[PDB]
């Protein structure tokens with residue numbers, strides 16, 4: 418059910434709608450549904466289809482789904498069209514003016530998406546507002562995973578010298594920075610940074626810090642500041658997300674409960 422016949426898909430290669438390190442994203446027509454088509458030519462087949470099957474089994478309103486894969490004599494990843502693009506660029510856009518309730522709602526949507534993924538035992542490893550997207554109905558979808566996974570904004574990835582890996586250090590949990598071990602509990606840390614990103618309308622975290630300098634920074638007893646219009650219990654939620662002990666951080670289930678409680682207190 419993952420494979421799409423070439424006959425069924427029209428790829429508008431002339432107009433590029435996204436740029437990733439592994440390949441570009443183009444406007445697409447799947448037969449008459451509108452879609453986004455990610456190419457991989459900018460870079461195992463058995464693990465590729467396996468990744469596709471897993472991604473298709475994921476069905477939740479706040480998780481970017483897989484429409485399918487097209488095989489051309491590099492394979493094309495077919496994803497639903499996201500009218501408002503990535504969450505970070507949206508909240509950064511001057512033409513849009515989301516309220517504080519709106520921003521909390523966008524965070525609650527990510528938590529709902531992540532609660533779903535964590536229950537399937539799927540660890541994202543690169544959660545950040547730049548890696549979530551919005552469709553026409555303003556539905557946030559946890560994206561940039563499985564076959565859609567890439568480096569969409571290279572500015573926020575530092576290369577480890579002893580490993581050679583591109584790491585999103587300003588979103589990484591303390592243990593991931595020291596041991597390169599990622600779990601659901603480290604995705605929870607990254608969720609706290611996403612919460613901060615939303616409440617500041619896409620400001621870059623720790624502007625005063627330079628790459629792997631971040632580890633000593635956090636070990637000095639430092640955390641991101643409370644943004645101006647961020648409610649006190651929302652900042653309390655973030656602080657819990659950045660707990661030094663992973664096992665002391667809230668689950669995404671707890672996060673859905675606490676954020677929806679904060680969200681219900683706003684009129685509009």
Ligand SMILES: C[C@@H](c1ccc2nccn2c1)n1nnc2ncc(-c3cnn(C)c3)nc21
Pocket residue numbers: 434435436442452453455481496497498499500502503506547548549550560561562565566569570
């Ligand atoms: C494959 C790509 C994607 C998916 C759907 C879509 N509709 C319109 C454009 N689209 C791009 N994609 N999938 N997950 C992503 N996460 C993030 C980004 C992205 C692109 N630019 N920036 C800054 C982030 N792109 C992502």
